[PDB]
Amino acid sequence: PVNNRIQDLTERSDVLRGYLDYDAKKERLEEVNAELEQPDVWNEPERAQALGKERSSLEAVVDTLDQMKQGLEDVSGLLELAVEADDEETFNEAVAELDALEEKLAQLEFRRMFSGEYDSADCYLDIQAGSGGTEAQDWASMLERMYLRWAESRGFKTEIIEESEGEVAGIKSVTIKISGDYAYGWLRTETGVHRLVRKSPFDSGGRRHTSFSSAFVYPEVDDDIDIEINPADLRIDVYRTSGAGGQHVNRTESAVRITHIPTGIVTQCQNDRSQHKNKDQAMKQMKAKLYEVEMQKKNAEKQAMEDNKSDIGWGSQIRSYVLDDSRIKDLRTGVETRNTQAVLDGSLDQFIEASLK
Amino acid sequence: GNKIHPIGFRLGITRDWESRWYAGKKQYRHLLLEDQRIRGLLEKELYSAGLARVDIERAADNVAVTVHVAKPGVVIGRGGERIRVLREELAKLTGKNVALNVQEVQNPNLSAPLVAQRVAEQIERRFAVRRAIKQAVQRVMESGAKGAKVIVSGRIGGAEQARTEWAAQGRVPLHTLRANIDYGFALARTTYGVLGVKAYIFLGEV
Amino acid sequence: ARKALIEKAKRTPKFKVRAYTRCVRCGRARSVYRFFGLCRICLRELAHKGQLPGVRKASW
RNA sequence: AGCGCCGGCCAACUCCGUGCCAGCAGCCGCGGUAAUACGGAGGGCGCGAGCGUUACCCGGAUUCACUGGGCGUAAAGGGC
RNA sequence: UGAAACUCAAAGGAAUUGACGGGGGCCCGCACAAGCGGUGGAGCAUGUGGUUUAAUUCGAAGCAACGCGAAGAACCUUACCAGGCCUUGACAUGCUAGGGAACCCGGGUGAAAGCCUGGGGUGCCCCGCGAGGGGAGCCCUAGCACAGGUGCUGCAUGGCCGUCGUCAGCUCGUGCCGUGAGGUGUUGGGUUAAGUCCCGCAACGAGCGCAACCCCCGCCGUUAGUUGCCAGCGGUUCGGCCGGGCACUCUAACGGGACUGCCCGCGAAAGCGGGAGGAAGGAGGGGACGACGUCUGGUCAGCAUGGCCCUUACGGCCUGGGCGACACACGUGCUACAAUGCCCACUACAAAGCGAUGCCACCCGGCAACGGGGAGCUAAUCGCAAAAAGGUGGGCCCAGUUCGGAUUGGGGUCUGCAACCCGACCCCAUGAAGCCGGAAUCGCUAGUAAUCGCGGAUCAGCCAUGCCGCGGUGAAUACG
RNA sequence: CGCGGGGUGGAGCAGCCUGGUAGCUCGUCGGGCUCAUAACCCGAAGGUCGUCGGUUCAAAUCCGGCCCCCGCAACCA
RNA sequence: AUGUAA
Ligand SMILES: [Mg+2]
Ligand SMILES: [Mg+2]
Ligand SMILES: [Mg+2]
Ligand SMILES: [Mg+2]
Ligand SMILES: [Mg+2]
Ligand SMILES: [Mg+2]
Ligand SMILES: [Mg+2]
Ligand SMILES: [Mg+2]
Ligand SMILES: [Mg+2]
Ligand SMILES: [Mg+2]
Ligand SMILES: [Mg+2]
Ligand SMILES: [Mg+2]
Ligand SMILES: [Mg+2]
Ligand SMILES: [Mg+2]
Ligand SMILES: [Mg+2]
Ligand SMILES: [Mg+2]
Ligand SMILES: [Mg+2]
Ligand SMILES: [Mg+2]
Ligand SMILES: [Mg+2]
Ligand SMILES: [Mg+2]
Ligand SMILES: [Mg+2]
Ligand SMILES: [Mg+2]
Ligand SMILES: [Mg+2]
Ligand SMILES: [Mg+2]
Ligand SMILES: [Mg+2]
Ligand SMILES: [Mg+2]
Ligand SMILES: [Mg+2]
Ligand SMILES: [Mg+2]
Ligand SMILES: [Mg+2]
Ligand SMILES: [Mg+2]
Ligand SMILES: [Mg+2]
Ligand SMILES: [Mg+2]
Ligand SMILES: [Mg+2]
Ligand SMILES: [Mg+2]
Ligand SMILES: [Mg+2]
Ligand SMILES: [Mg+2]
Ligand SMILES: [Mg+2]
Ligand SMILES: [Mg+2]
Ligand SMILES: [Mg+2]
Ligand SMILES: [Mg+2]
Ligand SMILES: [Mg+2]
Ligand SMILES: [Mg+2]
Ligand SMILES: [Mg+2]
Ligand SMILES: [Mg+2]
Ligand SMILES: [Mg+2]
Ligand SMILES: [Mg+2]
Ligand SMILES: [Mg+2]
Ligand SMILES: [Mg+2]
Ligand SMILES: [Mg+2]
Ligand SMILES: [Mg+2]
Ligand SMILES: [Mg+2]
Ligand SMILES: [Mg+2]
Ligand SMILES: [Zn+2]
């Protein structure tokens, strides 16, 4: 089977030369070598950085796909020289330096996973109904259970966080915690609206019926609740209270105002007779105003998700699972697997790996 | 949907078997198989003739195939040329005394399987299926039959939506045993797919 | 896996157990009658056709 | 020698590609895998130094009805 | 008093045919009621959903999917998975190039498939004593065209089937009514299992259905008398055993018989009620038989077949594994929970079928499965075969038990190349749940339900408690 | 450290003061009725009693410390 | 009480 475990390294390298543009990097690496050779290249050492480390960023690409096309050809002659001589050491020595090139190739395939800051966080998966109706709430449930079987395969945690079962039959919404390694990297290329076309069991006269559902994936960042505030940027003002009180309100600076310098937020207090029973309050309320603003940043980011996703609607598919003629076209890339009821069982590798490009 | 085959329904009442002989537990299977091969070979080669019935008889170690056809000449050949040519091709497979006869089909337009292959042929010729069917039923009634019914099922005219067209005249009492009704089936292979044909001719209440 | 099998069922085996009836008309492996060499479907088709000698619709 | 068109209105039909996508559209409506309705091709129809489109006017509109319409239930008898 | 922007390709009026109504009237069907026995609870068998898995191949989805395609999955089957393999192929036809090719026999390697090989030897048919060239069915390696696919679409299809529904209906021809869709006939009154028939009628006829003609069971007759049967005599070693006879019973063909035919009563008739005769009476009991159409019903995995897809692979061979998994969930069944019962000994009465490495009488060995002898039988002669309930006698005495046989240990028999996964049977021991089952729910109106056994197809064997048949015993209840 | 009332299954609440049993409604899981859902019917699962420290043979319960929570109070200059 | 969307 070893001559078939080098044939899979020939396919994994061609797909690596296709998306990475083996020609637009063999060419770009040549223009960097033409500029850095001149000793008069250190004229603005900032420019030399983005070229000297870029040349090492293109020599980790061009030169690696050169030692994979030549290194595997030297193994196609080393495995037939140990069979026709009964030499059993030439055959331990043509696979050892073959599994090291399978790591040089597997490492360079992590130019698909190393494209997203932090692609190992125990991500979450949000499937929502919408479109189709009761048919799609069934469809959203089938798409729910499908990803569960997916995570069952590659080895993750499937903790459902939040559900909402459909009114008639099905699921309106689900949140799954995909706790694992490279978890966000895998499911990241699933963010979209999956389309289902089939005979609806819910339609009175059993017609052919389209129903949509979405899956949205985000990684895991933590609480990020309260933020520290040192008095080095707070400016506490003091003055006299206003209104009733008598003499002990005329000669007493009992009211306080705490103005935060970088934020620009002001806050006062004057309730109690003591300046520091008021300053206690003014720190309290001040914590509150910063907690509001730092909240408003995140809710603004929340609406950024809402306003950039959308919309579990018709002209909005990424993949189309049509069960009435047995096909699942991923109109993004796009594969055309005919095993509909095998993808619904969790064979999304056919799509994930091919759609990380 | 429902209706039972009208010939299989009258065997030994109004209708007679087409392979008539005896065989025991130990022999029956092998005789029947080659017998169908006899039916197999002849069904293709004798189509051009207008093959209607295939009666077959057997006596200890010898078998006689009596072929009904509308155009006997097309079967026998030139002065008896092919009828001999066939008997040898036949009894080659058979390996026994294969007396190969021919018999007249007095009025093919009262033979249901014949009427059926006509229309099946007609619609492979891209004819107006309704016209074919109306035509077919009219001759069969002209030729004196007390009743006739013809139906064709499939992509009629090539249409994507399959449909069934039939036409009938006089009586066709499929529930009555004592009514003699010939039945026949013909498969029409087209560019867009297969069409099915049923022909019912009511010869009489015998 | 059909024609290879409508064929292989004819061919002699490694052990006499591996032999099995296929319907000589359509190649069916199930409900093959020894007496006819036919499956229940072919048996019904021919019987109605009248091409089974002595065989008839049984009514009692 | 070019321009429009070839589902019905309305004259001119088949092959491939696409697969409620890309797109068409004056109205009815086409496209969710075998589309004479989308794109191309072949073929055809209509005009020809032009051919289409858009805007506007009259016509069809007898749909403001003098020619030449209506009002029980369709729009419409005033509460008397 | 009274706009507009915007927006829609309609909003509407009447009437037609259906469908529906928590509208009416008149009807029918184990639909209910009236009863009998169950399912749901237990244990197990089986199918399914899930989940599990390298794969646990696929289809079936309310009725009408779920002991269904599967009327026989250890390998085969097998369509899935893993690995070892094959490229003109396991199979069809037609070529091109170089060769003998037949056909039979072995070696090594290997889990097999396969791979690498060593041999005998095409007798064919044209010239000749002949060397010898020449025929070609047939093989080897190549190169071809091709084959091959249980891969997709039952929403492109044929065929076949399920279903409403054995329901009483669905239409046509001519005529008449309406601008028209359409109506009339087909409605109405009576009757029937029925659009069954009678009468009436702008209808008059006609077709597909209904009924009948077909099959089994009932009574009787004719023909026929062994391989079947003995009423009578003989012999009878008691076994129709032998003679002898074909009456019987029987067997299997052919007919007869039932048609509301006859009497009484109601009625216009059709028909309805009662009585006789009769084996049988109002359709005698059961079967076959399924209208135009419905469910864009089921089946491309029986087969056929358009289109689409795979060609060192989505083809093909093999070995092994899987289809038999198991936290659970549902359907269908088997065995039960006991005294109208269980067990033991003895002892009667069936039918329909099957039978040549088939059934296997009788004998011997073994507790037994079975093994070893060995008669008979192309089957009314021989065998499977004991029918079981029942009957007679005895034991048990209400106890999770002489109930109940699940589970498990051990020891075997047989089939088969091979019983680890994964066969059935026998024996010893083990002796679980289960004390009559929640909500809910099924079948059956007479030889029916209940209960009791027997046979067959499939099949080496068998996971059959399934299915298709067969007879034995034999109820309850139907006001409505 | 103002006074006094609380924190109990998923939600909302009883049970404390008289120490040994945690109960009610909804929800939830399984089964039914339905062509299907809701409603309805049968059956089930479910709680460190906010914590930390121990009193008592024994703490949801009695007594302190801390953590949040609701209500009241914060007056005379 | 309800049953969307070819
Ligand atoms: Mg929701
Ligand atoms: Mg349905
Ligand atoms: Mg004051
Ligand atoms: Mg002061
Ligand atoms: Mg077998
Ligand atoms: Mg034009
Ligand atoms: Mg035209
Ligand atoms: Mg096209
Ligand atoms: Mg065009
Ligand atoms: Mg156009
Ligand atoms: Mg105008
Ligand atoms: Mg005008
Ligand atoms: Mg006027
Ligand atoms: Mg007007
Ligand atoms: Mg009005
Ligand atoms: Mg008025
Ligand atoms: Mg008014
Ligand atoms: Mg007035
Ligand atoms: Mg307007
Ligand atoms: Mg109005
Ligand atoms: Mg109206
Ligand atoms: Mg009604
Ligand atoms: Mg009932
Ligand atoms: Mg009842
Ligand atoms: Mg049970
Ligand atoms: Mg399939
Ligand atoms: Mg079985
Ligand atoms: Mg195998
Ligand atoms: Mg269909
Ligand atoms: Mg069909
Ligand atoms: Mg299907
Ligand atoms: Mg008429
Ligand atoms: Mg009419
Ligand atoms: Mg009618
Ligand atoms: Mg009518
Ligand atoms: Mg009639
Ligand atoms: Mg008699
Ligand atoms: Mg009768
Ligand atoms: Mg009938
Ligand atoms: Mg369908
Ligand atoms: Mg196996
Ligand atoms: Mg007896
Ligand atoms: Mg005996
Ligand atoms: Mg017992
Ligand atoms: Mg008891
Ligand atoms: Mg009844
Ligand atoms: Mg058996
Ligand atoms: Mg049995
Ligand atoms: Mg306690
Ligand atoms: Mg429930
Ligand atoms: Mg405390
Ligand atoms: Mg609602
Ligand atoms: Zn068959």
Side-chain angles (χ1 to χ4, degrees), chain B residues 1-4 25 153 155 160 162 172 175-178 194:
Chain B
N2 43 30
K3 281 153 287 277
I4 195 172
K25 161 213 308 172
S153 305
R155 299 176 57 176
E160 300 193 25
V172 187
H175 275 76
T176 307
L177 281 309
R178 87 187 147 88
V194 165

Side-chain angles (χ1 to χ4, degrees), chain B residues 122-145 147-154:
Chain B
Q122 271 179 304
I123 63 191
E124 287 166 290
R125 282 154 171 88
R126 317 213 206 274
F127 269 108
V129 186
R130 173 131 283 257
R131 232 190 155 85
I133 289 162
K134 272 173 169 160
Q135 278 181 8
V137 165
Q138 188 49 56
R139 301 131 55 257
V140 179
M141 290 305 291
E142 257 148 15
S143 298
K149 192 226 292 178
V150 176
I151 72 90
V152 177
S153 305

Side-chain angles (χ1 to χ4, degrees), chain A residues 14-51:
Chain A
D14 283 344
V15 179
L16 191 63
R17 299 180 182 88
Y19 163 73
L20 292 175
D21 290 344
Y22 184 82
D23 291 343
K25 292 190 178 73
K26 183 174 178 290
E27 177 181 356
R28 178 59 178 169
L29 180 61
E30 185 177 358
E31 296 173 349
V32 176
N33 285 281
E35 183 177 1
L36 300 175
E37 285 178 351
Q38 184 179 2
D40 286 350
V41 68
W42 295 101
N43 297 341
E44 297 87 359
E46 298 174 347
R47 180 61 179 169
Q49 178 64 64
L51 304 173

Side-chain angles (χ1 to χ4, degrees), chain A residues 42-240 242-277:
Chain A
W42 295 101
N43 297 341
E44 297 87 359
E46 298 174 347
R47 180 61 179 169
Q49 178 64 64
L51 304 173
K53 187 182 175 60
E54 179 187 2
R55 179 172 63 191
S56 180
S57 300
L58 297 174
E59 288 177 348
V61 176
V62 180
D63 294 344
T64 303
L65 292 172
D66 291 344
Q67 297 179 337
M68 292 302 296
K69 185 62 180 174
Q70 187 177 2
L72 296 176
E73 289 178 344
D74 296 343
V75 180
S76 293
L78 282 174
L79 297 178
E80 191 175 3
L81 188 143
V83 171
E84 292 178 349
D86 196 4
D87 189 356
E88 299 299 330
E89 292 182 356
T90 305
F91 178 59
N92 284 339
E93 288 168 341
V95 178
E97 64 193 331
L98 178 67
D99 288 339
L101 293 174
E102 190 176 2
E103 296 301 321
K104 292 179 179 297
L105 184 64
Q107 183 180 352
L108 185 60
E109 288 179 354
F110 289 178
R111 296 292 185 89
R112 290 199 295 267
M113 297 295 182
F114 281 162
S115 59
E117 176 68 17
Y118 194 60
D119 291 337
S120 64
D122 303 336
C123 60
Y124 300 152
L125 201 163
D126 279 342
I127 289 173
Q128 176 66 49
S131 293
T134 302
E135 168 73 4
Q137 294 172 346
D138 183 11
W139 170 235
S141 66
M142 292 183 287
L143 192 66
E144 179 270 334
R145 62 181 63 89
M146 182 183 79
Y147 290 137
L148 295 176
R149 299 182 187 91
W150 161 259
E152 167 66 9
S153 66
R154 290 185 174 276
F156 301 101
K157 291 293 290 195
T158 56
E159 181 180 2
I160 297 99
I161 303 301
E162 294 176 347
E163 293 186 343
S164 60
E165 293 178 347
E167 176 178 354
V168 180
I171 287 174
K172 287 178 71 70
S173 178
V174 286
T175 301
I176 303 173
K177 180 186 291 183
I178 302 300
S179 185
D181 287 343
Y182 308 134
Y184 179 69
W186 291 99
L187 285 177
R188 174 171 53 81
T189 184
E190 286 297 314
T191 58
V193 176
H194 301 294
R195 182 170 70 97
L196 178 66
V197 179
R198 58 169 176 83
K199 292 185 67 71
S200 177
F202 305 97
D203 190 56
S204 294
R207 294 178 297 181
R208 191 183 189 181
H209 272 258
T210 311
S211 62
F212 308 20
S213 63
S214 66
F216 184 79
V217 179
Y218 42 73
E220 188 182 6
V221 68
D222 53 354
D223 288 343
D224 295 342
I225 303 169
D226 292 346
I227 60 175
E228 303 298 322
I229 298 299
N230 63 339
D233 59 356
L234 293 180
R235 183 180 68 86
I236 301 176
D237 293 341
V238 298
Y239 53 80
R240 297 175 185 83
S242 302
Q247 234 159 4
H248 185 63
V249 74
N250 301 336
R251 293 193 176 89
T252 60
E253 295 176 353
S254 58
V256 299
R257 172 181 50 251
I258 298 178
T259 63
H260 194 194
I261 293 171
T263 308
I265 289 178
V266 300
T267 188
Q268 72 160 17
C269 184
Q270 298 180 348
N271 298 132
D272 191 65
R273 292 190 174 155
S274 178
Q275 163 173 358
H276 296 159
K277 185 67 181 296

Side-chain angles (χ1 to χ4, degrees), chain B residues 189-204:
Chain B
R189 95 283 200 198
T190 75
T191 62
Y192 43 85
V194 165
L195 272 278
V197 188
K198 294 182 184 189
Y200 301 80
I201 305 183
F202 181 47
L203 305 173

Side-chain angles (χ1 to χ4, degrees), chain C:
Chain C
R2 183 231 293 133
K3 196 173 183 168
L5 252 51
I6 74 193
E7 211 68 18
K8 191 203 301 174
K10 303 169 168 174
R11 142 199 155 206
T12 37
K14 280 230 282 290
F15 321 101
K16 69 160 157 65
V17 194
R18 300 201 178 161
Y20 62 85
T21 45
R22 291 206 165 263
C23 175
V24 301
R25 197 163 168 261
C26 74
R28 202 156 153 89
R30 309 191 94 106
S31 70
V32 194
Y33 286 81
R34 288 179 172 167
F35 186 87
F36 292 108
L38 303 163
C39 75
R40 40 168 282 268
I41 314 165
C42 289
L43 174 48
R44 182 169 175 253
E45 273 166 13
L46 291 170
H48 281 256
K49 213 69 219 151
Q51 299 181 354
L52 295 159
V55 177
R56 91 180 325 206
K57 287 188 56 68
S59 166
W60 71 102

